[PDB]
Design a protein around this ligand. Structure first.
Ligand SMILES: CC[C@@H](C(=O)N1C(=O)O[C@@H](c2ccccc2)[C@H]1C)[C@@H](O)[C@@H](C)C[C@@]1(CC)O[C@@H]1CC[C@@]1(CC)O[C@@H]1C
Ligand SMILES: CC[C@@H](C(=O)N1C(=O)O[C@@H](c2ccccc2)[C@H]1C)[C@H]1O[C@](CC)([C@H]2CC[C@](CC)([C@H](C)O)O2)C[C@@H]1C
Ligand code: NA
Length: 281
């Protein structure tokens, strides 16, 4: 039996706390012995505690500081996503030569609560270490926001133009994969019919020429989603007295992957029961 959503959220924030405390050993104890770290996306994984120590020690020596945002869960018993800002320099650099990077970390926690995998999404356009251009990263972050805009405008035909016929999507992570534009059309049609509104917060790109992610605050009519969420352990609040007036709120992170033609061919949404609220009335 897998760690509760709130426990996985605790582990993600604890990682930041132990990094911040400068505790190399303490940090390492949070990871499984054979854990994998990918940072940034589009690099070889670091594998195992010896390798992780080699990777983290220089950052600890550079007084790395991590300022976490809000964590998001999933319905897979394992995943959690944490936006953060990370500041660091060479050992003993003044603030002048410390760079700051916006990231979103994806962690997969084991049954015992230890981190099995960590993938860190951030692009050059998310970091003060460089002003080099990366038009592709910007394009992908824009596409993530454009999804929300088209849903909000009720423009299902428009939304589908962003997507590949080969689109695989999963909502929430830990459900199942749906394939194809007609499935996306049905999902989007249900969203629009439920008065879904998707308000985007923060974006980051991955450095793999493929990924981007956006934080989203959504609302929608309590019916029909609420009773379905309740039945599948995704809404643990009491039912509203009048389901016809109530709204559901969901905080999530949407990760997208973009193909060789600039179309979105992968989409995942990270949220769980602890990310779901009820606006009643
Ligand atoms: C810009 C990236 C990078 C950086 O400054 N150079 C950092 O990654 C390094 C120095 C620290 C690291 C990875 C070893 O801790 C972050 C990961 C943060 C987090 C979010 C809380 O993704 C996990 C969940
Ligand atoms: C049936 C539809 C809904 C849905 O998938 N699910 C659901 O109820 O129950 C989940 C579920 C999961 C496992 C088992 C059974 C049910 C899942 C299928 C959700 O889908 C919506 C509306 C289309 C969209 C809007 C934004 C977004 C993220 C919140 C995502 C980026 O599309 O989800 C919100 C709605 C709660
Ligand atoms: Na930059």
């Amino acid at each position: 039996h897998m760690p509760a959503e709130t426990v996985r959220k605790e582990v993600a924030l604890e990682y930041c706390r132990r990094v911040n405390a400068g505790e190399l050993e303490g940090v390492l104890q949070l990871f499984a012995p054979d854990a994998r770290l990918v940072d940034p996306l589009g690099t070889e994984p670091v594998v195992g505690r010896a390798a992780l120590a080699a990777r983290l020690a220089p950052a600890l020596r550079g007084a790395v500081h991590e300022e976490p945002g809000r964590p998001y869960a999933a319905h897979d018993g394992t995943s959690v996503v944490l936006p953060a800002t990370v500041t660091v320099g060479a050992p003993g650099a003044p603030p002048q030569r410390r760079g700051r990077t916006r990231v979103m970390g994806v962690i997969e926690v084991g049954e015992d609560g230890l981190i099995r995998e960590m993938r860190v999404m951030w692009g050059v356009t998310d970091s003060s270490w460089t002003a080099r251009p990366a038009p592709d990263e910007e394009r992908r972050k824009e596409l993530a926001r454009e999804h929300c805009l088209r849903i909000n405008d009720g423009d299902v035909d428009g939304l589908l133009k962003l997507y590949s016929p080969r689109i695989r999507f999963e909502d929430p992570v830990g459900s199942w994969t749906r394939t194809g534009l007609e499935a996306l059309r049905a999902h989007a049609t249900m969203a629009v019919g439920s008065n879904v509104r998707e308000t985007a917060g923060l974006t980051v790109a991955g450095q793999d020429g493929r990924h981007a992610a956006v934080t989203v605050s959504a609302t929608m009519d309590y019916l029909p989603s609420g009773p379905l969420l309740a039945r599948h352990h995704l809404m643990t609040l009491p039912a509203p007295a009048d389901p016809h007036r109530a709204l559901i709120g969901i905080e999530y992170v949407m990760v997208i992957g973009v193909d060789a033609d600039g179309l979105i061919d992968e989409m995942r949404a990270y949220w769980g029961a602890t990310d779901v609220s009820l606006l009643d009335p």
